[PDB]
Amino acid sequence: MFERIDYYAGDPILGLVEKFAADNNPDKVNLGIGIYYDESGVMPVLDCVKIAEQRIADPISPRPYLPMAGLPGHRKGCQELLFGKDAPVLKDGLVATIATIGGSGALKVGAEFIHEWFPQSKCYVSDPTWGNHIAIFEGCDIEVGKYPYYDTATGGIKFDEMIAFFETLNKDDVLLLHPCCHNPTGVDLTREQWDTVLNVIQERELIPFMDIAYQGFGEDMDSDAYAIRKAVDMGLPLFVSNSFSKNLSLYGERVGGLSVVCPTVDETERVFGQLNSTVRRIYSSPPSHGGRVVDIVMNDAALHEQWVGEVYAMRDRIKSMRTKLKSVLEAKISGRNFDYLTAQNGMFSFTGLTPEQVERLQSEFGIYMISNSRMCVAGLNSSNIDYVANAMVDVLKD
Amino acid sequence: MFERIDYYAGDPILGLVEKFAADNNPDKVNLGIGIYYDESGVMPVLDCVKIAEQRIADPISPRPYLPMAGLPGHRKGCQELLFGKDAPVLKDGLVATIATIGGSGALKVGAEFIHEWFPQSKCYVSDPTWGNHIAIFEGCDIEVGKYPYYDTATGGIKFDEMIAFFETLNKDDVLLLHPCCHNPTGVDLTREQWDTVLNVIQERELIPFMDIAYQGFGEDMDSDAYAIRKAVDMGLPLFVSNSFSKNLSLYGERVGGLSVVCPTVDETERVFGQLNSTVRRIYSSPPSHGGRVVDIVMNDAALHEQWVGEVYAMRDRIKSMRTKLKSVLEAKISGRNFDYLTAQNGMFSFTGLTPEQVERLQSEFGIYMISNSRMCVAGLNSSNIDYVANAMVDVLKD
Ligand SMILES: *Cc1c(COP(=O)(O)O)cnc(C)c1O
Ligand SMILES: *Cc1c(COP(=O)(O)O)cnc(C)c1O
């Protein structure tokens, strides 16, 4: 019956989860999946979340379906975080927002909406990008290409080539953009580069689709949203998918949002209705427990302030690991360049190791990076940094 | 930008949720959405769920992603419920099962898999069916038709016409079948009718896709699964979507499963891998809180026995309302026929009221049924049964 069905090779990120767990090497280190671990290598339960979950458990309450769009406080939490508290765009009623099944589910609903209402639009992703961007959009029968982004020669952005590429595109083509904390490279546009990009997007009448999953891990909540807020101010038809998986340490509860910025209230109503219709035919409505955690944390000013501080602590630990690893590598290999470790932003660094070097880190040392050279900086701590640096020196020796 | 985007009219079931809440009529009755309410008209928290949620809250634990397939105990819980504890098919390793975002998400993953691997297959749904069946499959760019089912003249199944229809179909065409508790009609196939249907399905090499959302509300857990277990015994390529929304009173946490029965272990591996790939590009992985509730309740023999008893109590209350309403209607309109109320099974009855009569129940009495005449029997209780019967008599008077 099913002999026609290909084996699934497994995902380049998620295929490593079982492998790492199974590995017998006592000095193994997980630098693969983009999860925040603390200084002891443990995933935190945030205090703001622990307080919200105690509230949800007291009393244990009936569990009706949420609205197709999710809880109104979850939607508002996403909007204020992305656009700013009491932003003009929100006061004007010009943003259609739904709660989603993580950032992945937001990308899927956005792609389904684009496939239905803009069937002739093609989507372009950065070279390189998180591979699931391509999987989600191709899975909606949308044609997906790449725009030039990471320059392997400079460790910077091929900015002029990227702009020249955008100038070739058609009205209503979609660009999947990373407003901050680029995945996988950690190489981000400057503010001046954003202003330039968004001007080309406006001129060419392209649709910017910003996917934000590590807000607060770059500079700060407001700075990380610069490109979003700039696009709004320019009047662009912006889609924004956001995830709380990493910044609420709530990966498993599947919490995110999708927002579409519209020119008029009537267009907001049309788009919001169609987002609801799209949700209904994918999963009906989103999960109550994660929605309540988001609602409670984002809308209590005390828990929200506590949460921001917890995110900035995670941000600061990652920054400490970047500096520590760079200083160790610079000492172990005299004169060779590791500036990328402190220049890159967010959860990831792009090490430039070849696929063979990444394979050798795995097989010889039990150190797990993604085959594209991406390393999760949060997997580093005082206990493993020397081991990792020594292994990297060994594999770089070629 | 978005003037091209149609207003969404809202769903025929879910469009009534806000309307009912807003309604000022003090005697309003919700017989729309298929939710179980107790004798006081309140949605229960099941005791088995309350115990599982106390466990999840003690201690509040880190929240890593679940596997793409969900928790192994959630998958096993679905399998044992559908196929039977230690069923030969499970011992043989011939069922590929994932946890899903409710029954809706299982239907969506199954439809996405069918669209990808069987792109030339058409799907057929019963006339009538739950409207979201059509929305989910059409939303995957699968062609959807209907097979003859409910006979308005007899209140029975057009069995011969349905069989004659199946005999016209192509190898690998998909039939969306309700193994029990038909939605919206409550009119179910007999065991002898199932054996006949499944023989035609085998002969024509059709793919049966059974969608089960009210297991335990028909006769009992095992009897309600007859058609599933018969299809397995016959060696059919069965897909089964199941929901725990209604039978665990856990609508908002989004818990269900999708299972595909395969002829060999290698085909099970191919199909299971592709179900994982399909999940990854829709929502990545399912929600932790609902998955843990399913895992804890289904795999603790004490909580599982408690749960079965709670479902059978809901089953029995619905059966008491069917008999009470039938006796009241038979007295209020002498000689006219209400046998359908006790002949139909599960959450629903198909009243045969016209769309205009349904509109009048809503506007004059604040009694909410779906426009296709479907009434949710669990919305009835001692406090509203006379009111409802009187209103039905008034609207039937034409
Ligand atoms: C993690 C991530 C997502 C989605 O993650 P979820 O767990 O589904 O929230 C989306 N985009 C990017 C760039 C990510 O890094
Ligand atoms: C309720 C229902 C579903 C799915 O419901 P979820 O809340 O998504 O579990 C699927 N099919 C049928 C026939 C139903 O009645």
Author numbering:
A (entry chain A), B (entry chain A): 1 to 398
From the article:
The psychrophilic aromatic aminotransferase from Psychrobacter sp. B6 is a representative of pyridoxal phosphate (PLP)-dependent enzymes. PsyArAT exhibits an activity typical for ArAT: transamination, which is a transfer of an amine group between aromatic α-amino acids and α-ketoacids. The mechanism of active site adjustment toward substrates of psychrophilic aromatic amino acid aminotransferase (PsyArAT) from Psychrobacter sp. B6 is discussed based on crystal structures of complexes with four hydroxy-analogs of substrates: phenylalanine, tyrosine, tryptophan and aspartic acid. These competitive inhibitors are bound in the active center of PsyArAT but do not undergo transamination reaction, which makes them an outstanding tool for examination of the enzyme catalytic center.
DL-malic acid sodium salt was used for the PsyArAT/DOH complex creation, but only L-malic acid (DOH) was bound in the active center. The ligand creates considerably more hydrogen bonds than aromatic inhibitors; 10 interactions with residues in the active site were present. Oxygen atoms of the α-carboxylic group of malic acid create strong parallel hydrogen bonds with two nitrogen atoms of the guanidine group from Arg374: (2.8 Å and 2.8 Å). Additionally, they are involved in contact with the amide group of Gly34 (2.8 Å) and Asn183 (3.0 Å). Oxygens of the β-carboxylic group of the ligand interacted, via hydrogen bonds, with Arg280* (2.9 Å and 2.9 Å) and Trp130 (2.8 Å). Hydroxyl oxygen of malic acid creates weak hydrogen bonds with Trp130 (3.2 Å) and stronger bonds with Nζ of Lys246 (2.9 Å). Interaction with Arg280* was of special importance; in this situation, the arginine switch was in the “up” position, and the ligand is shoved further from the entrance; hence, the helix H1 is able to close the active site fully. DOH is a ligand of smaller size than aromatic hydroxy-analogs, and due to interactions with Arg280*, it was shoved deeper in the active site; in this situation, Leu14 moved into the center, enabling proper rotation of H1 and full closure conformation. The small acidic inhibitor (DOH) caused different orientation of the Arg280* and forced closed the conformation of the active center. The functional dimer of the PsyArAT/DOH complex was created from two symmetry-related subunits.
